[PDB]
Structure formats: C-alpha cells, structure tokens
Design a protein around this ligand. Structure first.
Ligand SMILES: CCCCCCCCCCCCCCCCCC(=O)OC[C@H](COP(=O)([O-])OCC[N+](C)(C)C)OC(=O)CCCCCCCCCCCCCCCCC
Ligand SMILES: CCCCCCCCCCCCCCCCCC(=O)OC[C@H](COP(=O)([O-])OCC[N+](C)(C)C)OC(=O)CCCCCCCCCCCCCCCCC
Ligand SMILES: CCCCCCCCCCCCCCCCCC(=O)OC[C@H](COP(=O)(O)OCCN)OC(=O)CCCCCCCCCCCCCCCCC
Ligand SMILES: CCCCCCCCCCC1=C(C)C(=O)C(OC)=C(OC)C1=O
Lengths: 43, 97, 313
C-alpha cells in the first residue's frame, strides 16, 4: 500500500557516540618545539 | 613642531567630528562603594611605579657596571614579584583575582 | 606638504576603520555558516556608508548629563588619542620619527582610560558608572603586562625607537625568541581594546547615554585602536623585510601581516565565550603577571649571559 516504511534490509548504522579525534603532538613534543624555537631565536 | 601640528590636526579633526555628531541631527525636529575596585586601582598604581623604575633597562644594559646592573634589575623585578606574592597570599587578589 | 602627509595618514585610518566593520560582519558571517552583508553594495561594499549615513541622521538620545563638558570631551579625547597612536608607527618610515616612540605609544594608550571614565561619570546612570569602573580596572590591569612585555622585548631592541625594531628583526622574527611574550602580548592587547573574550561592555554579567553619532565616534576610535595594536604587534614581533630603495615591499608585507592579525581578532571573537570579570582579573594578576615578571627577569639576564646586548643607537 501507500505507506511510509523503512526498506527491506533497513537503514544503515547511525553514528551517535562522541568522536573527538585526539589530534596534535604530545606535551613533551610541544615543549620541545617551543624551546627549540626559543633557542633558534636566541642564537 | 611637526608633532605639534599633528596633535593640533588630530584634535581639530576629533572636535570637528564631535561637533558634527552633536549638531547634524539637530536639523530634524522629531552606587555603593566597593573596596575591591579601589584595591585593584591602588595595586595598579603601585605596580605602575615599580614599572617606572623598570623602564630605563634597555639603556641600563649598556653600562660597564654589568654585575651591579644585573643585580639591581633582578632585584627590582623580584620586589615587584614579592609585592604580587604578598598581594596574593593576604587575599588581596580576591573576587577580582 | 607635511599636512598632506598627516591627511594621508589619518583619512585612510578612517576609511580602513569604516571597512573593518564590513570585514568583521562578513568574516563573522562566514564563520557562522551564513553570509554577511551582501545586499546594499556590490559584495556588500556600501554597507558601512549606508550605516554611517543612518547613524548621522538618527535622533539624539537627549541625556540629562551630569557634566556637559566631559560628555563632549570623552569622544574628543578617544578620537584624538586613537589618531595619535599612529604617528610614530614605522611602515617603514613613520610620520613622526621620534626616539621614544614605543614609550610614546604606551603613554598615549594609558591616557585612553579617561574617555571611559569621563563617559561613565558624565552619564546619569549609576550602573553605567559601575560598568565604566569595571572597564577602567580591566584596562589598567592589562596595561601592566603591556608595559612589562614591551620592556622585555625592547631589551632585544636596544632603544625605544620603533624604527630600530625593523633593524632588530632583519635576521629573524622577534616572535621566535619571544613567543611567550608574543602570546601574552596578543591576549593583553585583546583585553586592552575591550575585545572578545574580554568584552564585558557587551555582557549581561559604559557609553549607552550617547547618541548614535558619538557612539559611532567611540566605535571608530575603538576600531582604530584595534587596527593600530595589530600593526604595532606586527612591527613588534613579525618585522618584515625592508629594502630602502623599495619601501613598498615593507608596506605590503606589514599590511598583509596586520590584516591577518586583525582577522585573527575577528576569529577569536567568533570562537570563544566571554570571561567572567573575576576570571580575566585572575588571568591577569595570577597568570600573565607572574610569567611576565619571570620572562622580564629572563630577558634582562639573557643578553648579558649570551653576549647579545643590542646597540643603543
Ligand atoms: C639587600 C642588598 C642588595 C644589594 C647588595 C649590593 C648589590 C651590588 O651589586 O652592590 C654593588 C654596588 C656598586 O658597587 P660597584 O662595585 O659597582 O662600585 C664601583 C664604583 N662605580 C659605581 C663607580 C662603578 O653598590 C655598592 O657597592 C654600594 C651601595 C650599596 C651597598 C649595600 C647596601 C645594602 C643595604 C641593605 C639594607
Ligand atoms: C603575536 C602573534 C600571535 C601570538 C599567539 C596568539 C594566537 C593564539 C590565540 C589563541 C586564542 C586565545 C583566546 C583568548 C584566550 C585567553 C585564555 C588564555 O590563553 O589563558 C592563558 C592560560 C591561563 O591558564 P588557565 O586559566 O587556562 O589554567 C588554569 C590556571 N590555574 C592553575 C591558575 C587555575 O595560560 C597562561 O597563562 C600561559 C601563558 C603563556 C605561557 C607560555 C609559557 C612558555 C614556556 C615556558 C617554559 C615551560 C617549561 C617548563 C620550564 C622549562 C625551563 C627550561
Ligand atoms: C582635555 C584637554 C584636551 C584633551 C584632548 C587632546 C589632548 C590629548 C591628546 C594629545 C596628547 C599630547 C601629547 C604631547 C606630548 C607627547 C610626548 C612627546 O612629544 O613625545 C614625542 C617626542 C619624544 O621623542 P624624541 O625623539 O626624543 O624627541 C625629538 C628629539 N629628536 O617629543 C617631541 O617630539 C618633542 C616635540 C616638541 C614638544 C612638543 C610639546 C607638545 C605640546 C605640549 C602638550 C600639549 C597638550 C597638553 C594637554 C594634553 C592632555 C593632558
Ligand atoms: C564619517 C566617517 C565615518 C564615521 C563613523 C561611522 C561609520 C563607522 C561606524 C558605524 C558602524 C558600523 C558600520 C557597524 O557595522 C556597527 O555594527 C557592528 C556599528 O555599531 C556598533 C557602527 O557603529
């Protein structure tokens, strides 16, 4: 009949959880890059 | 002389724009005292005096008495830090921290 | 001929302030998943002209002001000090080449709190005066780190001369030896201009009695201050290459860096919530000021320990 229904296999998996991708460097790497920029500037 | 002309020109332009803004639309008919703010202003004043002591340092580094100069420069910045640490620990920097 | 040079400074200041409002509305549009003004002019370019004409013929608010004299003097002082902050700026050559231009800018920016204080007292509203006192206390707080950061940087310059700061940065940007000073400087200039996240004059947790004209005058003084502090930050930390036979290379380069830094102000106001008032007081007095004193000690002692004391002249 003319009735709005989901399809035969159903819909796909809907993502709902939190996705924070965790990008960036480590803390030691960021302090190393900052201290290296300081040393380059000082030299 | 060029500076006095420039200050006079900036003051004249500002006074002209204010005189326009107060007299161009005329054509159409149409607190309790807070101890905390006073304390942050006085702390500004005292640290601003300490800054006034610190301001000749780019010229003071040119001296031949560098051990004494470095000692007194570090001592002035240290006394500014001790002023801040006393202001911190005696709850002077509170509710406007 | 010098008056032509003064006018070619100060009238392009007013035009760049007029179009900074368009740039702000468009950039805050396209960062908020929408378009800015694009209806009034071609690509929205006539929006500041239409808004200026609208504000000049708007009805006066008619205040029963406490003092007429300071009510007039606060926009005059704000605009005069906003225009005089530009005259020692080396781009590559300043209008007024003065030996103590850095200290001149620090003094003339310290004078700009009287416009806030006089506009807050000249209003009848006690709450306008309370907001003015909060804004003055904020501004004088961040002037402390302005002064000390700027002193620490000029320990690498050798003088208070703004034009020497181009010579200082011929081999490297000064943001490389002084990036912590640069970032506390940038946030402190953000809090100087009452700019978000430090705009507590727009938050519900001082110049409301002015008409649309004088409000526009305070507003254009504020945006002149914003462009100026970004130009001064550019000269101070991101100093460009200067060829003395082609000065326009320096002018194009510092202009691009200053525009990107003003757009970075626009990015910051479109990205973060406001501070509460005690929180930016905490940010100054308990975070920026101890690090700024530590780095001032470090930038005193560092040219002596590396044998890198700059020249006086
Ligand atoms: C607490 C005291 C801290 C500072 C101690 C002295 C630091 C210093 O470098 O002094 C040398 C400096 C200068 O010594 P100098 O070696 O540069 O002197 C040679 C002469 N001239 C200046 C021409 C180059 O001061 C003195 O020697 C005398 C003045 C200070 C004496 C100590 C006062 C202490 C008071 C405490 C209360
Ligand atoms: C000039 C060109 C641009 C410069 C950079 C600016 C672009 C980036 C702007 C980002 C958006 C900022 C929007 C406004 C944000 C305001 C808030 C904020 O930033 O708060 C600052 C925050 C405030 O902290 P907070 O409040 O977030 O954290 C909580 C703090 N307590 C614990 C007190 C409650 O951090 C600072 O104050 C740090 C300032 C910079 C420090 C730089 C340190 C350099 C490294 C030193 C050495 C370290 C290693 C150890 C020793 C090693 C010795 C060899
Ligand atoms: C309510 C009242 C109205 C308020 C609104 C209008 C006023 C506020 C805005 C204007 C502020 C004016 C500031 C005037 C002085 C600024 C300091 C100064 O002149 O510094 C620049 C320079 C120092 O550098 P240097 O290179 O050493 O000098 C040349 C030597 N080769 O020095 C020089 O170049 C020296 C040049 C000659 C001397 C100039 C003196 C100017 C006139 C005196 C001040 C006039 C205003 C007084 C009131 C201002 C408000 C308090
Ligand atoms: C005569 C030279 C220009 C005088 C000043 C008027 C134009 C600049 C300010 C106008 C303005 C604009 C465009 C504007 O976009 C705006 O909204 C953010 C304002 O209100 C807060 C303004 O006041």
């Amino acid at each position: 009949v003319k009735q709005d229904m989901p399809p035969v296999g159903g819909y796909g998996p809907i993502d709902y959880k939190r996705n924070l991708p965790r990008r960036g460097l480590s803390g030691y790497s960021m302090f190393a890059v900052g201290i290296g920029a300081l040393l380059f500037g000082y030299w | 002389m060029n500076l006095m002309i420039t200050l006079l020109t900036n003051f004249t332009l500002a006074t002209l724009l204010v005189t326009i803004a107060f007299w161009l639309p005329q054509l159409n008919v149409y607190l309790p005292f807070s101890m905390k703010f006073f304390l942050v202003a006085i702390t500004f004043l005292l640290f601003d005096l300490e800054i006034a002591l610190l301001l000749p340092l780019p010229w003071a580094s040119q001296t031949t008495n560098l051990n004494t100069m470095l000692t007194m420069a570090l001592l002035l910045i240290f006394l500014l830090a001790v002023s801040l640490a006393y202001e911190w620990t005696q709850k002077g920097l509170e509710w406007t921290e | 001929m010098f008056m032509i040079n003064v006018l070619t400074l100060i009238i392009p200041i007013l035009l760049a302030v007029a179009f900074l409002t368009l740039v702000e509305r468009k950039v805050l549009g396209y960062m908020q998943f929408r378009k800015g003004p694009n209806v009034v002019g071609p690509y929205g370019l006539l929006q500041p002209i239409a808004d200026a004409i609208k504000l000049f013929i708007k009805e006066p608010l008619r205040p029963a002001t406490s003092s007429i004299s300071m009510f007039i003097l606060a926009p005059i002082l704000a605009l005069t000090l906003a225009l005089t902050m530009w005259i020692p700026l080396p781009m590559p050559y300043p209008l007024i080449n003065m030996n103590l231009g850095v200290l001149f800018m620090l003094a003339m920016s310290s004078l700009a709190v009287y416009s806030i204080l006089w506009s807050g007292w000249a209003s009848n509203s006690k709450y306008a005066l309370i907001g003015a006192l909060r804004a003055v206390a904020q501004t004088i707080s961040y002037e402390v780190t302005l002064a000390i950061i700027l002193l620490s940087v000029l320990l690498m310059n050798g003088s208070f001369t703004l034009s020497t700061l181009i010579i200082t940065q011929e081999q490297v940007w000064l943001i490389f030896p002084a990036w912590p000073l640069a970032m506390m400087w940038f946030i402190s200039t953000l809090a100087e201009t009452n700019r978000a996240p430090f705009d507590l004059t727009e938050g519900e947790s001082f110049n409301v009695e002015y008409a649309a004209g004088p409000f526009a005058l305070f507003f254009m003084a504020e945006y002149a201050n914003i462009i100026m502090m970004n130009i001064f930050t550019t000269t101070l930390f991101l100093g460009a290459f200067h060829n003395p036979y082609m000065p326009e290379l320096y002018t194009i380069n510092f202009t691009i860096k200053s525009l990107l830094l003003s757009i970075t102000f626009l990015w910051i106001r479109a990205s973060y919530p406001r501070f509460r008032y005690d929180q930016l007081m905490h940010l100054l007095w308990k975070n920026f000021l101890p690090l700024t004193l530590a780095l001032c000690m470090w930038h005193v002692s560092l040219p002596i320990l590396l044998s890198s004391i700059p020249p006086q002249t």
